[PDB]
Design an enzyme around this catalytic site. Structure first.
Site, short mmCIF file in Angstrom:
data_model
loop_
_atom_site.label_atom_id
_atom_site.label_comp_id
_atom_site.label_asym_id
_atom_site.label_seq_id
_atom_site.Cartn_x
_atom_site.Cartn_y
_atom_site.Cartn_z
N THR G 136 0.83 -1.20 0.00
CA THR G 136 0.00 0.00 0.00
C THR G 136 0.86 1.25 0.00
O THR G 136 0.74 2.10 -0.89
CB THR G 136 -0.94 0.00 1.21
OG1 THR G 136 -1.76 -1.18 1.18
CG2 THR G 136 -1.82 1.23 1.19
N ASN G 197 14.40 1.56 10.23
CA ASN G 197 13.99 1.03 11.54
C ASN G 197 15.15 0.58 12.42
O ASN G 197 15.08 0.75 13.64
CB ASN G 197 13.02 -0.13 11.35
CG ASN G 197 11.60 0.32 11.10
OD1 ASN G 197 11.27 1.49 11.30
ND2 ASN G 197 10.75 -0.59 10.65
N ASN G 219 7.43 5.27 16.46
CA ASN G 219 6.50 6.29 15.98
C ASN G 219 6.52 7.52 16.87
O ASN G 219 6.37 8.64 16.37
CB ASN G 219 5.09 5.71 15.89
CG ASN G 219 4.99 4.57 14.91
OD1 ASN G 219 5.87 4.38 14.07
ND2 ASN G 219 3.93 3.78 15.02
N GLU G 245 11.91 27.18 3.38
CA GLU G 245 13.25 27.71 3.61
C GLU G 245 14.29 26.60 3.69
O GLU G 245 15.33 26.66 3.02
CB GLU G 245 13.27 28.53 4.90
CG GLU G 245 12.69 29.93 4.76
CD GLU G 245 12.92 30.78 5.99
OE1 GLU G 245 13.97 30.61 6.65
OE2 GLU G 245 12.05 31.62 6.31
N1 LIG Z 1 8.89 2.98 11.74
C1 LIG Z 1 7.79 2.24 11.59
N2 LIG Z 1 7.66 1.42 10.49
C2 LIG Z 1 6.55 0.66 10.33
C3 LIG Z 1 5.54 0.69 11.28
N3 LIG Z 1 4.57 -0.16 10.88
C4 LIG Z 1 4.94 -0.72 9.70
N4 LIG Z 1 6.17 -0.23 9.36
C5 LIG Z 1 6.94 -0.56 8.15
O1 LIG Z 1 6.16 -1.33 7.26
C6 LIG Z 1 6.97 -2.30 6.64
C7 LIG Z 1 6.15 -3.53 6.26
O2 LIG Z 1 5.18 -3.19 5.29
P1 LIG Z 1 3.65 -3.64 5.47
O3 LIG Z 1 3.53 -4.73 6.51
O4 LIG Z 1 3.11 -4.13 4.14
O5 LIG Z 1 2.86 -2.32 5.95
P2 LIG Z 1 2.63 -1.07 4.95
O6 LIG Z 1 3.96 -0.49 4.57
O7 LIG Z 1 1.75 -0.03 5.60
O8 LIG Z 1 1.90 -1.69 3.66
P3 LIG Z 1 0.44 -2.36 3.76
O9 LIG Z 1 0.44 -3.46 4.79
O10 LIG Z 1 0.04 -2.92 2.42
O11 LIG Z 1 -0.54 -1.28 4.18
C8 LIG Z 1 8.06 -2.63 7.65
O12 LIG Z 1 9.28 -2.87 6.99
C9 LIG Z 1 8.16 -1.39 8.51
O13 LIG Z 1 9.34 -0.69 8.21
C10 LIG Z 1 5.67 1.50 12.39
O14 LIG Z 1 4.79 1.54 13.24
N5 LIG Z 1 6.80 2.28 12.55
MG LIG Z 2 -1.48 -3.15 5.64
#
Ligand SMILES: Nc1nc2c(ncn2[C@@H]2O[C@H](COP(=O)(O)OP(=O)(O)OP(=O)(O)O)[C@@H](O)[C@H]2O)c(=O)[nH]1
Ligand SMILES: [Mg+2]
Ligand SMILES: Nc1nc2c(ncn2[C@@H]2O[C@H](COP(=O)(O)OP(=O)(O)OP(=O)(O)O)[C@@H](O)[C@H]2O)c(=O)[nH]1
Ligand SMILES: Nc1nc2c(ncn2[C@@H]2O[C@H](COP(=O)(O)OP(=O)(O)O)[C@@H](O)[C@H]2O)c(=O)[nH]1
Ligand SMILES: Nc1nc2c(ncn2[C@@H]2O[C@H](COP(=O)(O)OP(=O)(O)O)[C@@H](O)[C@H]2O)c(=O)[nH]1
Ligand SMILES: [Mg+2]
Ligand SMILES: [Zn+2]
Ligand SMILES: [Zn+2]
Ligand SMILES: [Zn+2]
Lengths: 49, 429, 54, 53, 48, 429, 430, 429
Positions: G136, G197, G219, G245
């Site tokens: 996404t 991360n 977060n 800026e």
């Molecule tokens: N820093 C941070 N990264 C997050 C967090 N939640 C998810 N991620 C990132 O999301 C990545 C995994 O992608 P997904 O599990 O597919 O989540 P998404 O990026 O929102 O994509 P969708 O699940 O399709 O919505 C991980 O490698 C994390 O780096 C968070 O709460 N904090």
């Molecule tokens: Mg998701």
């Protein structure tokens, strides 16, 4: 009499400031209203009371 | 020496209501009608705008006109609405329909006889009629159409009498009408033919001057009409009050109109400042002239720097020094030669009234016959031509019997107006 | 084109359509549907470096 | 229980009944003229001139 | 700050959708208060 | 004075009239017994001290009329002005126009005559019908032409409900619409679109209603009707009338099919989470999702918009919204209508109907916008008509009722002429 | 004005936005119900009822986190709209999120964005929080970045992107997703912000001393960084800066706008009151690779432009002294053609700690947004994973069966190679 | 002898706010504008910086400029912020973005219309305008762009009028901007032609002065602005107060500018001493001159020891005669002949004022046109070329209408100024 003229000019200027500050036009207030005008405000309507 | 006023249509009636508010306040007249002033000068020339009644009441010499009656309850609902004669209220069942044809030929015609009867009543009761004044908007149906009809009939029996018209020229940006160009074009030629002089007030410019200079957050239609009322009160100050250098409507017309068809002016008022900036302003001519000749002070949305000033008139009111009120004008003429026409030297006429407006120590009203007046007529002329090219909204005018030729005739006259302004602007010595 | 591939190269256009000429034209049976269309009933990689045309 | 309930929602609940957690701010750069900047009359473009005229 | 403790105190007994809480309540003791006598199948507050 | 006769025809007209009169009674504080004259345009003041609606409920099917007669507003409604037939038109334009319509319009015109004599300043007639059925289309057409031939140039406003482009509760519905378009084009001064899919979409999206119904659709229709009529009902800076906005909206006699939209239309939960400012509500109006007709304006060219603002709306914010709309390029105004905007100001916010879905709002706006995009629904309906008439489906029903076969060809060709006219008005010169 | 619309894309974006907006409400004194018991104009809008509505658009393709927000404490704070949830997730597929299911929701998202922007008279731009690893956040994020670029012209775009770290990675195809979304992050994003991360995890493991910190903690740190960035235009300060800026002071070339982030002083409650956290000390910690939120080693590249947002009781004495010490420190080196290379902005507002968080009340702080040539190595890791996956068509049928062709991968790889090349060129000496 | 002042950018606005604080404190003015001085010598020449309203309030004749309204809000909310005219603050919707192109061609060029409107109003209101005053920083966007644009469009309107600018020259040792050399280079070539004399300020030297001389533990922008404000008030000591040996701005230009391009001075103040050493310091004029010619006491970061003084000016204030203002000048001339220029006998002009700054019994302001002033021009030159060769941070400027030719011309002009300074430094008799 020149000093008097300066004093009179200053006093009239202060009166001007006071009147303009208290003026309904500049303060968006309807101090003068009529019996009908209280109910109906076609031109003077500024916002909801 | 005394003038009789008429308000036409919704805009005209609402402007005239607050104009009479200002006049009654300046002359010390109650909203009911009784005199409650504290000076002899207030009553000295009260016959200029008012007539004394049987019981000592002071009734304005005003004729109220509108095809819409739904908006003539507000004119009497205003704080000074009970000042006018009940028999000076002229109404029709249905509105003008925003139609110049209806307001001038079909609906206005059935209503113009009583209006002229009231005007003739006022003129006959009048001892020496100085002129007829009119307040209306050219963007409406019964303001443009019925107002032009009224002035046309007025010229038929009072040729030499001064015809003041405070015409409200609608603006494209603050526009709320689609038949706006049609009504403005149909009324401009009648204004040219049947008005000794006609100052143009633009709603966009009124909104801007209230928005920037006054800076007050909510200038409504009442606040817009306040400035127009102040200008009307200041244009006739010397008829009602003594002054070092007085004047009247004819004298301003003589000193402002070089050629018969050039009688469209710009209005300006001074001083106008915000509530916050009130401590910080100096009350003198060396500040009144700046505000008056300032670009943003004009109540017409066409900047006077477009062309050159044919003539200018400065009705100063209050405690002034005559040489300090004339040498300021000498300085501006001396140092702004580019915006003043060369072949007419000494373009500015200054007049002094001793008594300023109520609540003000010193003020001034500006009347400018600048060649920039062609700008508003243009910017509505392109709109009218675009509307006319595709025959838009002509059935609403030809259903009253008015033929498609008069649109072209009005276009021709209006183009002649613009062309003569441009030619006199570009004229060389 | 350069070393950096364009939006049209990726398959997407960042250009505002001419509403006055094309978008704001109403669709009718006679005038649009008859000459070069069907009925009003309900129903890429363009890289200048390669052989595709932007 | 959700992890957001444990951390974020718990912090919000704490904030509900502990108003002293909100820190004092000094937004003196935001003022009456900044609010006047928001006045919708700006977008109306009153008495404005372009090349097109 | 005991996040889990305050969660048990407030979030566990919080109600987000009272419609769902009334429609399908489980072992919930909160939000069960609905309209008092508003819903009678007879359609009238009068006795059956 | 300033009356307005509401004629509801057919079942759809009956329900929309029920909702409209419910809303009007709520606005004017009228109990369902008849217990400042803002009510004069809708409620005639009976000699027995009550207020009787200036309406005629006409239907060939007696069910809805009997439901009204036995409902809650029995004592409000006149026992006449409530005409009922003995058998409906059976969703047949021929039955509604030539067989059953002929035998009931004779007394329908008598009832309308009584209503007109009761009126003294009648502004016009507002007709409420859906052309989907027989009485709405056939009897609506017959009644419209009899009114046109009897009352001359009285204003007519047909708030018609054409078949929606996708859903429809009839199969002969395109036939009825195509047959009735002749009357709706010839004997109707202004025709407004009130299709059902768009109102369903607003109720589902903006109101968060999972199961919208004719109740909500009629409530929204009544909201729009009240918003338009409140200009002459109540006060305001810019009061407009029926002929006023007809002049400011209709550029050509054949070009009068107009779209409608309303905002803000949100629920109680939604209301207090948004800045329901004038600019926001105007933007919601001009967005396609906020219209009561499934016809995207951005797919066409705007020709004339009439905005109706109620509440604390100021001409200031009206002009600001107009400026931010003109400076916006997603919607194109036609080249021959530069201004293209009419504005009406009203100082009474719309009273919400309890038990509905609208929320108490301080300001609202309804747009009556004539645009060239209206050709989409016409192309939709005559494509259905061609598909069904290619092999003469359901034509025996129309033929056996006294209506000849050339009817379909002539009506389709009038609709095609309307197609060409709406293409031509929008086509650039 | 100085409004800034916060667009959260994907699960990562939604949770980061949850933290960001709890911090913003705490800073502006707004109850989690949206009422107050006016710099908030930059983030919240008034209402006739007297409550505040955030200037945010949460957008997810699947309804889990969105519905959890709707059922959370801040349900009354957040508007019922501007909380867009689709029906089914992109399933970690850039093609699915960009061509099949993102298409049917981006129109609604753009309508919501336009509605939000109509209420903003001086909108500086959009901060888009997302992780390009997920389907996404990659696909719909790129699509929305395109449509925002074409819908608002040259409006500012701060893309806070969470790249997949070289070692820790929660997905197998997120190298594909980030390689595909690098086009959007490279063209339709004015400033791209690296928020990987592992660096945050290490910073929290050592400098904050808590055994099990989670997505909530990371977060919270990201929200602290965003609040530090926006505090310059929200509150007072000696050197007030805006979103327009530091872009000029940070981006040397239009296509070189990928920047690292770092924060200090990140200390626990125990560590808060035992060390004199001077401005020089916190600046040294910032320039140290320990204080970074992205693991691009300073010595492996050269800084091109460092932007330093100081908050609290920081006087320009200490800021200038720290700058001088950093310049004379030979361990780090700047690019030759940018002598100054420093942008400084001071804010009077002290750092604000959220109760239940892990940070400690510190009277001063500093955040770095640094454009350096060392950022080429994360792309080197990314495409070294990408070509290994792409050697014999691994996980490519999923993408090609959802609307995209085979040329997309190769063209994105070429774009990444050019992003290596121009960074190497700007790092090259004259 | 009027001086009309202006502030550009947040740096210039803060410096001007502190300057008006100092001037009002000297002339006995509350934040509300009322006068409570201990002598009439304040009101004797109060006009030079303040204007008197008809109500007696003294308002600074200052014009404030910033594309960010936050700076205007901060200045207005400052301790002396209520002094300025509310309409004398001019603001934009979006800031300069720290871009000379935005501040000079696209966004700054739009707002200079209103800037010039208010500036011309104030400048004309002067009885005899002695000069214009400007305070800004060349390292920013608004100060560097809009300030130079204002000086350019003010030179065209007031050719012979004196033009003060106080430009804060940034330094890499106190670097906080990376478009710093671009903005400095783009503003220097404008100031060369558009400013008759201009002395530079470096935060490096202000910080050094505060640290070593004032020994402030935490020097702040308030302290730096107070120093700059005190010396900028002292530069007009003879203008505002009677003295033994009067001087004016034109006199300073005549006696400090040998050639039109060489008008960039280095400046200072005296006496300055720490809080703990005020009572130990014997304030004699010999000590004043020693500190005045001390290299560390210069508030522009460039050692005079590497160059030679073209000219110097010492505006002394307080009870003091002429030999402490000339004989020690002779002493320094004789014992630092290597530090001065042979072909200019009497390099140092002295002016005497009878009113010292309050809190002191005598003081002096130094303005020196040393040939070492071009060291900063060198270093900024190669700084500019460093990014110009690699085209770094140039797309921001080129996307706002500017071209590479303008950058090349600016660098050429700066290099020409540098070469003129060097050749006049090493020139021999
Ligand atoms: N820093 C941070 N990264 C997050 C967090 N939640 C998810 N991620 C990132 O999301 C990545 C995994 O992608 P997904 O599990 O597919 O989540 P998404 O990026 O929102 O994509 P969708 O699940 O399709 O919505 C991980 O490698 C994390 O780096 C968070 O709460 N904090
Ligand atoms: Mg998701
Ligand atoms: N908006 C709205 N439309 C209605 C309602 N009831 C019927 N309609 C419309 O009426 C159309 C079909 O016609 P009918 O329902 O038969 O009503 P009719 O037009 O009077 O035809 P007859 O029943 O034969 O008299 C449908 O397409 C609906 O759009 C209603 O309550 N609200
Ligand atoms: N300045 C001002 N303008 C007005 C006022 N009332 C109406 N107008 C303008 O007049 C136009 C409408 O004309 P209208 O009064 O309806 O003309 P009428 O129908 O002949 O009376 C609008 O475009 C308004 O801008 C008012 O009180 N003051
Ligand atoms: N002396 C002094 N210098 C300041 C002050 N504020 C900022 N500066 C200097 O101004 C420079 C930045 O100017 P900037 O804010 O970008 O100007 P702007 O873009 O026109 O607003 C910095 O190098 C500071 O050293 C102040 O209050 N006093
Ligand atoms: Mg029926
Ligand atoms: Zn792209
Ligand atoms: Zn079809
Ligand atoms: Zn390509």
């Amino acid at each position: 009499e020149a000093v008097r003229a300066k004093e009179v000019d200053t006093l009239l200027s202060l009166q001007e400031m006071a009147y303009q500050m208290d003026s309904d036009f500049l303060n968006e207030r309807e101090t003068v209203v009529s019996e009908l005008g209280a109910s109906v405000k076609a031109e003077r309507y500024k916002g909801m009371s | 020496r005394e003038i009789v006023s008429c308000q036409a249509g919704q805009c005209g009636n609402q402007i005239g209501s607050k104009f009479w508010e200002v006049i009654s306040d300046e002359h010390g007249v109650d909203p009911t009608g009784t005199y409650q002033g504290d000076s002899d000068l207030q009553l000295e020339r009260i016959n200029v705008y008012f007539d004394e009644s049987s019981g000592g009441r002071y009734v304005p010499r005003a004729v109220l006109m509108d095809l819409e009656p739904g908006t003539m309850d507000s004119v009497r609902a205003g704080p000074y609405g009970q000042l006018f004669r009940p028999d000076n209220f002229i109404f029709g069942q249905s509105g003008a329909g925003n139609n110049w044809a209806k307001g001038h030929y079909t609906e206005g015609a059935e209503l113009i006889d009583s209006v002229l009867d009231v005007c003739r009543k006022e003129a006959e009761s009048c001892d020496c009629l100085q002129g007829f004044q009119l307040s209306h908007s050219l963007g409406g149906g019964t303001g443009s159409g019925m107002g032009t009809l009224l002035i046309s009939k007025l010229r038929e029996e009072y040729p030499d009498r001064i015809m003041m018209t405070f015409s409200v020229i609608p603006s494209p940006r603050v526009s709320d009408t689609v038949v706006e160009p049609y009504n403005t074009t149909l009324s401009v030629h009648q204004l040219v033919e049947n008005s000794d002089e006609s100052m143009c007030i633009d709603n966009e410019a009124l909104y801007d001057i209230c928005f920037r200079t006054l800076k007050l957050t909510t200038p409504t239609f009442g606040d817009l009409n306040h400035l127009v009322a102040a200008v009307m009160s200041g244009v006739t100050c010397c008829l009602r009050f003594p002054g070092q250098l007085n004047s009247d409507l004819r004298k301003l017309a003589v000193n402002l109109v070089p050629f018969p068809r050039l009688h469209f002016f710009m209005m300006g008022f001074a001083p106008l400042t915000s509530r916050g900036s009130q401590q910080y302003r100096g009350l003198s001519v060396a500040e009144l002239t700046q505000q008056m000749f300032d670009a943003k002070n004009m109540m017409q949305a066409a900047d006077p720097r477009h062309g050159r000033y044919l003539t200018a008139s400065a009705l100063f009111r209050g405690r002034m020094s005559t040489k300090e009120v004339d040498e300021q004008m000498l300085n501006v003429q001396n140092k702004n030669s580019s915006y003043f026409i060369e072949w007419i030297p000494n373009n500015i006429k200054s007049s002094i009234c001793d008594i300023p407006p109520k609540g003000l120590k010193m003020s001034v009203t500006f009347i400018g016959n600048n060649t920039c007046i062609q700008e508003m007529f243009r910017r509505v002329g392109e709109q009218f031509t675009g509307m006319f090219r595709r025959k838009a909204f002509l059935h609403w005018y030809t259903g009253e019997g008015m033929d498609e030729m008069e649109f072209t005739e009005a276009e021709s006259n209006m183009n002649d107006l613009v062309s003569e302004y441009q030619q006199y602007q570009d004229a060389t010595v | 084109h350069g070393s950096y591939h364009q939006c049209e190269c990726y398959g997407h256009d960042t250009q505002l359509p001419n509403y006055r000429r094309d978008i704001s034209k109403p669709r009718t049976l006679q005038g649009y549907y008859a000459p070069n269309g069907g009925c009003p009933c309900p129903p890429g990689l363009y890289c200048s470096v390669r052989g595709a045309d932007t | 229980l959700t992890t957001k309930n444990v951390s974020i929602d718990a912090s919000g609940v704490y904030l509900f009944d502990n108003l002293e957690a909100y820190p004092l701010t000094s937004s003196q750069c935001v003022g009456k003229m900044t609010k006047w900047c928001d006045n919708p009359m700006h977008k109306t473009n009153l008495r404005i001139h372009y090349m097109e005229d | 700050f005991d996040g889990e403790a305050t969660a048990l105190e407030h979030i566990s007994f919080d109600v987000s959708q009272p419609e769902r809480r009334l429609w399908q309540p489980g072992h919930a003791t909160t939000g069960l208060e609905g309209t008092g006598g508003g819903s009678t199948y007879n359609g009238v507050k009068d006795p059956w | 004075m300033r009356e307005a006769i509401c004629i509801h025809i057919g079942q759809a007209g009956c329900q929309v009239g029920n909702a409209c009169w419910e809303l009007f009674c709520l606005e004017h504080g009228i109990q369902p017994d008849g217990s400042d004259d803002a009510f004069n345009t809708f409620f005639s003041e009976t000699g027995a001290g009550k207020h009787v609606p200036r309406c005629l409920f006409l239907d060939l099917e007696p069910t809805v009329v009997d439901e009204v007669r036995t409902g809650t507003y029995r004592q409000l409604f006149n026992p006449e002005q409530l005409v009922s037939g003995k058998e409906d038109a059976a969703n047949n334009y021929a039955r509604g126009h030539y067989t059953i319509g002929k035998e009931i319009v004779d007394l329908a015109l008598d009832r309308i005559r009584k209503l007109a004599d009761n009126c003294t300043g009648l502004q016009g007639f507002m007709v409420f019908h859906a052309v989907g059925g027989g009485t709405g289309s056939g009897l609506g057409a017959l009644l419209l032409e009899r009114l046109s031939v009897d009352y001359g140039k009285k204003s007519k406003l047909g708030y018609t409900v054409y078949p929606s482009p996708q859903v429809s509760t009839a199969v002969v519905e395109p036939y009825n619409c195509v047959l009735s378009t002749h009357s709706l084009l010839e004997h109707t001064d202004v025709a407004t679109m009130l299709d059902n899919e768009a109102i369903y979409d607003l109720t589902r999206r903006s109101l968060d209603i999972e199961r919208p119904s004719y109740t909500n659709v009629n409530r929204l229709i009544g909201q729009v009707v009240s918003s338009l009529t409140a200009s002459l009902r109540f006060d305001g800076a810019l009061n407009v009338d029926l002929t006023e906005f007809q002049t400011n909206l209709v550029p050509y006699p054949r070009i009068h099919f107009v779209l409608t939209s309303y905002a803000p239309v949100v629920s109680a939960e939604k209301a207090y989470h948004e800045q329901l400012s004038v600019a926001d509500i105007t933007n919601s109006v001009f967005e396609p999702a906020g219209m009561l007709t499934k016809c995207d304006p951005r797919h066409g060219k705007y020709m004339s918009c009439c905005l109706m603002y109620r509440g604390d709306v100021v001409p200031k914010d009206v002009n600001a919204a107009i400026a931010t709309i003109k400076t916006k390029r997603t919607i194109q105004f036609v080249d021959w209508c530069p201004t293209g905007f009419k504005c009406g100001i009203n100082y009474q916010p719309p009273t919400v109907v309890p038990g509905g879905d609208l929320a108490k709002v301080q300001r609202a706006v309804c747009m009556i916008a004539n645009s060239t995009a209206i050709a989409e629904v016409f192309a939709r309906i005559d494509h259905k008509f061609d598909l069904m008439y290619s092999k003469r489906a359901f034509v025996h029903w129309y033929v056996g009722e006294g209506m000849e076969e050339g009817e379909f060809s002539e009506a389709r060709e009038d609709l095609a002429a309307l197609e060409k006219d709406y293409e031509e008005v929008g086509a650039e010169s």
